[PDB]
Amino acid sequence: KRLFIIKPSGFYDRRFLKLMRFYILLTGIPVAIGITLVNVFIGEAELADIPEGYVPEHWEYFKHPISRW
Amino acid sequence: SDAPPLTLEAIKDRVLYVLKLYDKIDPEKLSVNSHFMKDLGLDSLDQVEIIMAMEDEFGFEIPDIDAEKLMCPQEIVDYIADKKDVYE
Amino acid sequence: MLKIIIPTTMLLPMTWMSKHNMIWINATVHSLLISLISLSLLNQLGENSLNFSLTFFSDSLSAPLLVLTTWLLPLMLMASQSHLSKETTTRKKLYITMLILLQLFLIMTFTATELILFYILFEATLVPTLIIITRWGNQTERLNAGLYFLFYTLAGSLPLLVALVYIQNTTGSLNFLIIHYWSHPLSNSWSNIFMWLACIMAFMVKMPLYGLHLWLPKAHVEAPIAGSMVLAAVLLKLGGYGMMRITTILNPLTNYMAYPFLMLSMWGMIMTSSICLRQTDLKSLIAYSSVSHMALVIVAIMIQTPWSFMGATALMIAHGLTSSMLFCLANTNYERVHSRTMILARGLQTLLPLMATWWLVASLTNLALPPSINLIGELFIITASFSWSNITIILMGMNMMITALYSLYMLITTQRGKYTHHINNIKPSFTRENALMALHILPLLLLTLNPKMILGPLY
Amino acid sequence: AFSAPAAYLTHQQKVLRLYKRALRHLESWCVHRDKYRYFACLMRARFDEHKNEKDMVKATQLLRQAEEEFWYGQHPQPYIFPESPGGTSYERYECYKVPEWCLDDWHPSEKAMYPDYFAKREQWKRLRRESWEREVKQLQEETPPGGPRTEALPPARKEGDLPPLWWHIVTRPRERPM
Amino acid sequence: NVLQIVRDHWVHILVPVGFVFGCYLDRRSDEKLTAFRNKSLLFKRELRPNEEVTWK
Amino acid sequence: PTIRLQEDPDPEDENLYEKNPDSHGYDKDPIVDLWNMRVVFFFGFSIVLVLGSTFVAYLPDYRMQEWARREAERLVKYREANGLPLMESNCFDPNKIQLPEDED
């Protein structure tokens, strides 16, 4: 026969975990999608020689677009 | 799953079973309310052998201080029931 | 460096002009914002430090320490607002003001270009800490603790002041860059021996070195929760940072002036770890653990190798996070049962499961489980010490064992077994407490992915 | 476990306890049922040999040398019932025992489930609150002036009285609580 | 509508304004240390046809 | 009085859950408490943690380790293409050093 199981309250831990997951995901799903879209459509730069008489900007010495920005 | 919840009725049948398997007790004149020393004519060592038989029966050990006073089958039934949390 | 500093100062009138019921919200929001802005000092050039101006500069040694300070402020605010609820508006604003002034002094000390400014700020940190301990401390013993914290510190730092002004008279400068580029060997003379001692003992007492450590159990145990958090996470690291800076003018004397401090630190590592095994107070246990960890840092700084400096930086950061988390965990239970005795409340895992998870993770980082940065720092220091002498492994090995022992002892005593029958006022964990634990723990775990950030200048 | 202890054990209680211990350790040595039954009857006989001794001193010395024999000949690894204080299941289910006062800290959404259980719990709480003062008064009545002498508690004696100090005995968690 | 909510939330401009002011003062501090701009043996360079300074 | 002083009795601590069964432990006022929870969670987990970890993960190579690797590659190619030693035990040119002339 079904008896009652005396446990401490699980409402508050569960609510905390849902809130933490919610906020972390709220801002971290857009970042994951943005990094994917950048990596797929923009991509990294390719190594090239410095053309004659040309002087690159300081950010043009890095290959990843996010690091460059 | 494991064993079904114990029912006072199964308990008491089992205690009476072990008690009529005891040679010093008259089966046709033993009752659930029979005093061990007073009605059945036993001494303390017989009563000790009886508690030890009861632990062998129900697979759990009974402390000496508590046992000193299980002087009738009904008291053994009540002890086992209140220990193993059986209400019916 | 001005961009980080002015907003921190701004925090002051922002909290003094806020409504009575919005002080915590405002302070927490803008503290977090300041922490985010600071996060941008981690970009380091490589060959040299970033010199913003004549007065301030940031290093790879410095950047991790500043981020930890700024991150610790909002956590202290979250931990404080519970036990300060009954307080008047003005006294709550005064408490927050103390915390803000402490953050301001700390940021400046780490980035000051020259030693006299470093000394002044490193000493200015004493006033808010003392006020916090003695005014908001729960027990009668706080007054004695405050005196111990003050006097032990000043008895070390005043000879440092004399030594610094003497050094600027003989060298012409105390600017750290000039100090480094124009470094010349220290001869072996009585004058140089006492100059070495006067340059070292202040940072030794800040760490603390074993035998000069008696102020720390008092002060860390008698302080309110935020006071304890900042005392363990950041204020102990002033000694390590200052020693790492100052030991550039001390060569080649350190080769043999370091022997007694190494002996004290290794044996006292063993001693304080053993002490943690027989402790009836739960805060007392966390304090002595801090001592044991800082002994390891003292050894690393004294042996003067690149691997030892890297390990010391990593261990300082990791200890700062873990020790603050452990103090907050103890304070939650204290808030429940109003006693610090460790065997009073038992079997708390049955009543508070998620807090038991936080306890387990904090205890696992305290014993330096791989691949946490606690073990990264400890392993680098142990390797450097092995190179220094192969016999150090025996002491290092023994310490690792005793640390595991008392860490799991604390965990088992407080979380396992059966609950004390009489205590029935253990309410569910608040969202505030769980979020405080997570905000301690997530950053530590995140740091494992990018180990180089906390490694330091030598890297 | 359930009975209040006394200031000391009588000679008779010591003798019965030694009888039980000797029998259990003999069963540990004598694994099989028939051989144990034989040697247990021999034990009972050797025990009955001095049953009717009137000299208390010689009875005490018999008990003492019997205890010495038991200690020299005990089983180093006697059988223990699994839930007994040395058993392999002794405190196995203590992590599942939650005190009942935890149920008052439940969220109202948690108590929305199980309405009948919580109504009946409110009834039990009313009962305890309305019995407490009578319990205290009765205990003050039935107790000697120099404090209690044993750990024994009196029953209820009036019409609607409850035995004093009953709440934490009646509301034990369970022995298999989950 | 906005009068009293400005009067009770105006404190939320202090720290961002301090941040902006600090960035400004850092730039002004940089403007004082230009004695070796385009003068170091490692980075000395020929100016582009239209640029005035190598860094500001 | 057999007393020493006129003192308030030490009060019992109040349970935030009693007047607010879902109270987050930030404040007695349920609205202020809810908003304290929200600002903590947003500015700590959303802003600082996620965006800050991303910013630190994509920090440009100012430590010059890629540059150093490419430089070492050039040097190794040139040096074992010419039969030269990979590294020289002298960091500085011995022709630019002027040792003290006599050693005894």
Ligand SMILES: CCCCCCCCCCCCCCCCCC(=O)OC[C@H](COP(=O)([O-])OCC(O)COP(=O)([O-])OC[C@@H](COC(=O)CCCCCCCCCCCCCCCCC)OC(=O)CCCCCCCCCCCCCCCCC)OC(=O)CCCCCCCCCCCCCCCCC
């Ligand atoms: C969680 C809730 C509770 C809280 C928990 C606590 C949470 C705390 C979190 C705190 C916040 C943290 C923030 C940190 C942010 C860090 C971001 C970062 O650093 O990015 C790094 C990095 C960024 O890349 P990058 O260096 O910028 O790019 C370099 C290249 O240029 C790029 O190369 P490419 O452009 O060529 O590649 C293409 C592109 C895209 O690639 C593609 O589209 C194609 C991929 C290949 C697909 C091929 C098959 C598919 C198609 C087949 C079928 C269709 C075709 C056939 C159909 C017809 C069939 C007939 O690649 C990607 O975009 C990869 C995805 C990147 C995602 C990054 C997400 C970061 C999130 C940051 C915030 C964190 C929020 C957490 C929650 C987020 C939600 C999860 O991303 C990764 O590291 C991804 C990791 C991939 C791992 C691969 C597996 C390796 C496993 C080996 C080890 C394990 C072995 C076993 C172990 C032991 C077991 C026993």
Ligand SMILES: CCCCCCCCCCCCCCCCC[C@@H](O)O[C@H](CO[C@H](O)CCCCCCCCCCCCCCC)COP(=O)(O)OCC[N+](C)(C)C
């Ligand atoms: C509880 C924690 C407290 C903090 C720990 C503080 C540690 C301070 C200890 C200082 C380390 C060593 C100090 C100086 C190094 C050598 C000391 C000396 O004994 O060595 C010999 C010195 O010879 C004699 O020993 C002279 C010193 C003896 C007089 C000092 C009294 C020591 C008694 C211990 C008192 C405890 C001091 C700490 C107070 C708490 C070396 O011979 P010598 O080559 O010729 O001298 C080298 C100096 N020269 C080159 C200028 C000539």
Ligand SMILES: CCCCCCCCCCCCCCCCC[C@@H](O)O[C@H](CO[C@H](O)CCCCCCCCCCCCCCC)COP(=O)(O)OCC[N+](C)(C)C
């Ligand atoms: C509870 C439920 C649990 C189950 C759910 C689990 C979900 C999965 C969890 C596991 C996730 C594993 C992720 C593994 C890491 C992948 C990304 C990683 O590689 O990023 C690292 C980088 O991590 C970041 O550096 C972490 C930085 C630290 C974050 C700090 C947060 C802000 C500060 C907070 C206060 C700090 C106080 C202390 C300061 C000292 C290293 O990147 P790297 O290999 O290079 O990238 C190569 C390509 N790049 C360089 C172009 C990107």
Ligand SMILES: CCCCCCCC/C=C\CCCCCCCC(=O)O[C@H](COC(=O)CCCCCCC/C=C/CCCCCCCC)COP(=O)(O)OCCN
């Ligand atoms: C909380 C407890 C901390 C205690 C710390 C105490 C130790 C601090 C270190 C020594 C303190 C005094 C050092 C003096 C400051 C340095 C100045 C200096 O270097 O000048 C020396 C001068 O050196 C001295 O005069 C120092 C002599 C000592 C005077 C005071 C003695 C105090 C006690 C000394 C031993 C204690 C130090 C270690 C104790 C550690 C704490 C237990 C050389 O200059 P000249 O005079 O020009 O000599 C060359 C030209 N003829």
Ligand SMILES: CCCCCCCCCCCC(=O)SCCNC(=O)CCNC(=O)[C@H](O)C(C)(C)COP(=O)(O)O
């Ligand atoms: C392998 C394991 C080791 C085993 C070794 C053990 C060795 C045991 C040897 C035998 C021990 C003795 O004879 S012990 C000698 C003790 N002598 C007496 O007790 C005499 C007086 N009798 C009484 O007091 C009561 O009648 C009483 C007997 C208590 C019964 O009472 P009830 O009837 O009212 O229950």
